[PDB]
Each structure stands twice: as C-alpha cells, then as structure tokens.
Design a protein around this ligand. Structure first.
Ligand SMILES: OC[C@H]1O[C@@H](O[C@H]2[C@H](O)[C@@H](O)[C@@H](O)O[C@@H]2CO)[C@H](O)[C@@H](O)[C@H]1O
Ligand code: DAN
Length: 623
C-alpha cells in the first residue's frame, strides 16, 4: 500500500453478522468467511456486494449474497442480505455474483445449487443447477436534515429458458457469470461475460446480453478457446475487450465489435502480457478491469496477484495502468507477503478505492482501502505521457510545415536521460541496461569488448509488456561509427536468444565499408557503403513474418525476406543497441546512438520520410 494510503477490515471474518432468514424467522448470525467482492457507485450511493460463507470457506457449502451501503463515502455502512438460497439441504447456495449498474437499479446474476458436494466443473449434468436474476431498487431521502437511503430487493427470476441445448459442435451443460462487475454498453444493452461447460466437461467464455431492460436474453455466436474461465469485460472505442483466466498458462485477451458474434485475439496490445506466477505454471485468478476518465484522458485499470508462493495462495496483489499502448506497473496494493487474491476497484468524484480479499489458514476477510497515493502516482505518469505526445505533435517538420510526426502507437523512447547504468524510458515503463557507456546529447557513445545496451522483452519475466513485438513492430534510431572494425560488428537488432547469436532481424557493418543486414537465419549478403564520422538514419520493420531495413529513408538489398519460418510464433528475448552488451562475444563496436523509438505496428512510407527528415528536432535535451 503506497505512502499516504490507508484501510480498514470491513467484512470481518468470524465477527461481522447478517440477517439470516429461515421459516419466516430472522436472526443475526456470525459468518465464517467473506469472498468474491464487487464494489460500485449508484447515483451517489456506494454499494459493496459479496459471498457470505456461513460455515466454512469450502466452495460447496452454505452461502447467501450479502450487501452493504453508505452515503458518506465509506465512513459508515448499513447491512443486508440481497439474495437468499433455496433452503433445501445443509449445502444449498447462490454463487459467483456478477453486478451491473443502470439508472438507480442493481442487476445481480447468480448460480443456484441445492445439494452437490462436488466442484461444478466436474458435474456430468445439470440436475442440481439453476441460473437467476435479482433486481434491487435504490432511493434517496433527507428526513432529518441529513442524507439517507434505502434499498429494496425483488424476488429472483430464473433465466434458464434462454439457454439452448446445443452450440456449434457440442452439447450444453451449465453456465455462470464471471464474478465482479459488468457493464452497460453505449447502446443501452446489459452485457454479462459468462463461463460455460459442455457435455465433455470443457470450459469456455461467451457474451450474454439484453435489449429490453432484462426481460429477455441472448447469446452471441462466437467463443474463446477451450480453457478460458471467469472472464471480465469493458468497452473501448466501440469494441468489447474480454480479459480471461487460464490455469497453468499466460492470460488470453480478445476483441469483438459485434456483441460477441465474432472474436479476435488481441495480439498487438494486451494478450499474453500477464502471467499467473513467476514461471506461469500455477492456478490463475479473478480480476478487476474497468475504463475511466482521469484529468481528461480515458484509460484502463487492471489488478491480479503475483503468486510467489504457489498453488492457490496468491500473495502480492498488484495494480496496472494503460492506454492500449504503454503499460505501467503502479505497484503493490496488499501489505507485505500476505495472501490476497480477489479484488474490486472504484473511481468516484475524483477519489480511488479498492475492496479486496485477505487469507490466513483458509479463513477470509474483505478490507476496504483508500488509494490516495496510487492516484497521485497515476496522475504524475499521465501528465508525462500527455506532455511528450504534445511536444512531438507540435514540431514544424520541414517542407509552411510538412506532415506531423506520428505518435499513434508509440510505446517507448530512449533519449537525453540516463544514469550510470540505465538509459531511461521517457514514457517511464521499461528502462534499458548498459555497459562502457559515456553520456552525450540525446543519446550514448559506446566502446570496447562488452559495450552496448539491452532493452528487455521476454527478459521482463512474469509480466511482459512488449509481447506485441512477436507479431509486429517498428524500431528507429540515428547512428555514427568511429572506427573501422576487424571483422563484422553489431549496430542494432532483435534477438531470439540471450547471447544475441540467434537473430530475428538486425544490422551490422564491416571492414570493407559495407552494411550487413541480417534476415533471420538466411545467409548474409553485404551491400551499400558508409564513411566514418558520418551520421545515418536507421529503421527496422517486421509484420506478417516479413522484415525490412532502411538507411536514410531508403530500403536496402535483401529487404522483404522471411524472418519467421511459418512454423511457430516467435519468442523475442531483447533488442540490442550499439553492441551485444556481452563480454563473452568477440566484437568491439565504437559508435554513438541517439533517439531510439519503439512502435507497436509497421509504419507507412510517409511516416518514415518525416521521421528521417526531422531527426535534428526531436531530442529530449531542452527539457
Ligand atoms: O484454496 C481454496 C480454493 O480451493 C479451490 O479448490 C481446489 C482445492 O483446494 C484442492 O484441494 C483440489 O480439490 O482442487 C480444487 C480445484 O478445483 C477452489 O477452486 C477455489 O474456489 C478456492 O476455494
Ligand atoms: C467453485 C465455484 O462455483 N466458485 C469459485 C470460482 C469458480 O470456480 C469460477 O467462477 C468458475 O471456474 O472461482 C474460485 C476460484 O478462485 O477457484 C472461487 C469460487 O468459489
């Protein structure tokens, strides 16, 4: 928890009580565990929803859906049960509650079981299952001079009639919501991401929506891959963005422009970025994922635990910030090495809060946190992004001004800032490490066996922000060479292994004053010429498994070659700059490099000429 932020234990394990109703009688009852938190804002009133696990934390036991609410931003709360289970046996339950806010109503979706003691994904049929919808109505009043509020909960309705017996190539079994909070799309529709089983017991995700305020429901035709569960969704620039959990694997994210009729993997932005454990081979988790507007810029907020300990413990809850381009680690929200899996984040009247799980010996509470510090840091990063995007967009490029320098899809920038061992990211997400570097205006100058810089890719570890590079990228720089080499030496490139011996795409130079471009594993043909002391402009592109190299804006011989054998998907290790940064490799490069830019797509020709023509104008030096 950052400096300046604080919390309280709100749903207190083995302490807080709720109004348990049975046989027309109501009694205040102490609860063992609270889980599956969901935190929202209804027209001025804060509401918190979750699971009340009466007797034990075991998933298949006695559970009702509880609610708490406040009109003073979290100093005081009232308590109630919003949805009760069927009362048929000692293990009846309503599970995984998923919430939508619209006008002054709360729409809550839950599964309902009568008596099974087995985990739901292992049932062979639906004999014990039902799926339901309850609506709560929120009204405000002021009797006494001070604000008040009440909430009236309606009886649940089954939506079973809207589940077809068959989908494309399978037979249906059961379905449930994805937990946490869902959304109202910009056309008015109610939209719930859902998880479904079929008769072979495989799990997968769909879109489940309503056009008549929840009176009827439909399914979109498409689906995620088998193995994706507990999905969570938001709306961005006209698409639904669906974010999934996959046990024992890196997380998959999908895009859809038509209410779920067609699904496409987000290879160029967010898919495969977040892993469930340092080696990504442990159970996954539930996540909060919303779109909000801060100081006039729209952005996304996402949380997930790092799970250093393993299995289901899921310690160290982290918060991330992104604009669908750059991706920044806000930090750790939980405290110390405690266990902390599920979570919910809310932005209200310009303040940030989080409701989340804590776990000691399989006994669970929900704490409520005021994230004053997290928001401070966020605002600082958003200003820096806005400032550098504005600076670059305002430069008068030469012919009266030519076309503008592009910032769409720009991800990283290495320029004037540097310490003794790092080259700093102007966008503040990923730095590069260095050796034998001497600082100069807007760049670095290297020399000797072992010199150069390294901008990590798969080397980032658990969470990999530049995974898009395995699908498409553009890399740009200015360079000058100071000594004719003995053999062939490296200048800039993308490497598949950690030495730099297995290249995907790169550029070197040799003793006969020629360039040596390198296309994957293809045999190397030297070409063109250069003079010492002369400044040159360099660009590398890769898309659709094809790579290119430009000098001063023009493509060299051999451009247009295959860099990925149609076989698999590349796993890039790092980009190397002005050397391999490896003492064990024999080359010695004596060169200066300035202003390195990284983009998540292949640039167009006009975009390349402007960048070339405007080299002397973009450094960060004056600021
Ligand atoms: O740690 C609590 C979680 O248990 C998970 O269930 C595990 C269970 O702990 C393990 O012993 C074995 O039975 O495999 C189960 C996975 O299906 C639940 O999935 C999770 O909801 C937590 O309750
Ligand atoms: C078991 C169940 O009905 N609810 C569980 C839920 C569920 O498995 C998922 O929503 C569908 O796979 O997830 C988890 C979990 O962290 O493993 C805890 C919930 O108690």
């Amino acid at each position: 928890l950052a400096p300046g932020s604080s919390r309280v234990e709100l749903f207190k394990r083995q302490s807080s009580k709720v109004p348990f109703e049975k046989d027309g009688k109501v009694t205040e009852r102490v609860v063992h565990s609270f889980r599956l938190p969901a935190l929202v804002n209804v027209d001025g009133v804060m509401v918190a929803i979750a699971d009340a696990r009466y007797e034990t934390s075991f998933d298949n036991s006695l559970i009702d859906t509880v609610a708490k609410y406040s009109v003073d931003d979290g100093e005081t709360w009232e308590t109630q049960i919003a949805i009760k289970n069927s009362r048929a046996s000692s293990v009846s339950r309503v599970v995984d509650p998923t919430v939508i806010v619209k006008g002054n109503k709360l729409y809550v979706l839950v599964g309902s079981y009568n008596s099974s003691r087995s985990y739901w994904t292992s049932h062979g049929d639906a004999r014990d299952w039902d799926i339901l919808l309850a609506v709560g109505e929120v009204t405000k009043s002021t009797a006494g001079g001070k604000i008040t509020a009440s909430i009236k909960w309606g009886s649940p309705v089954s939506l079973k009639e809207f589940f077809p017996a068959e989908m494309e190539g399978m037979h249906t079994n059961q379905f449930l919501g994805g937990a946490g909070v869902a959304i109202v799309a910009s056309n008015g529709n109610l939209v719930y991401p859902v998880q479904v089983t079929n008769k072979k017991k495989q799990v997968f995700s769909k879109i489940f929506y309503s056009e008549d305020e929840g009176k009827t429901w439909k399914f979109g035709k498409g689906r995620s891959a088998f193995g994706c569960s507990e999905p969570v969704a938001l709306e961005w620039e006209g698409k639904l963005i669906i974010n999934t959990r996959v046990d024992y694997r890196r997380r998959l994210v999908y895009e859809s422009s038509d209410m779920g009729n067609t699904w496409l993997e987000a290879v160029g932005t967010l898919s495969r970025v977040w892993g469930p454990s340092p080696k990504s081979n442990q159970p996954g988790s539930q996540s909060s994922f919303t779109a909000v507007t801060i100081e006039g810029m729209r952005v996304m907020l996402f949380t997930h635990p790092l799970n250093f300990k393993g299995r289901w413990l899921r310690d160290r809850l982290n918060l991330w910030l992104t604009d669908n381009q750059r991706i920044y680690n806000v930090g750790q929200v939980s405290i110390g090495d405690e266990n902390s899996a599920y979570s919910s984040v809310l932005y209200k009247d310009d303040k940030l809060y989080c409701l989340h799980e804590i776990n000691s010996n399989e006994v669970y509470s929900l704490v409520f946190a005021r994230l004053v510090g997290e928001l401070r840091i966020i605002k600082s990063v958003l200003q820096s992004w806005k400032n550098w995007d504005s600076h670059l967009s305002s430069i008068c490029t030469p012919a009266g001004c030519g076309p503008a320098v592009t910032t769409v899809g720009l991800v990283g920038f290495l320029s004037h800032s540097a310490t003794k061992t790092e080259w700093e990211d102007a966008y503040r997400c990923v730095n590069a490490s260095t050796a034998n570097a001497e600082r100069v205006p807007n760049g670095l100058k290297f020399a000797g066996v072992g010199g150069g810089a390294l901008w990590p890719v798969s080397q980032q570890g658990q969470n990999q922000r530049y995974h898009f590079a395995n699908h498409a990228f553009t890399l740009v720089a200015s360079v000058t060479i100071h000594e004719v080499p003995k053999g062939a030496s490296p200048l800039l490139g993308a490497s598949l292994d950690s030495s730099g011996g297995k290249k995907l795409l790169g550029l070197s130079y040799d003793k006969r004053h020629q360039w040596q471009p390198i296309y994957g594993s293809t045999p190397v043909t030297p070409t063109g010429s250069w003079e010492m002391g002369k400044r040159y402009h360099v660009v590398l592109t890769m898309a659709n498994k094809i790579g290119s190299v430009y000098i001063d804006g023009e493509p060299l011989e051999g451009s247009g070659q295959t860099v990925v054998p149609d076989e698999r998907t590349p796993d890039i290790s790092h980009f190397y700059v002005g050397g391999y940064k490896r003492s064990g490799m024999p080359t010695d490069s004596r060169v200066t490099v300035n202003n390195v830019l990284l983009y998540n797509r292949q640039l167009n020709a006009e975009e390349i000429r402007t960048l070339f023509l405007s080299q002397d104008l973009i450094g960060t030096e004056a600021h």
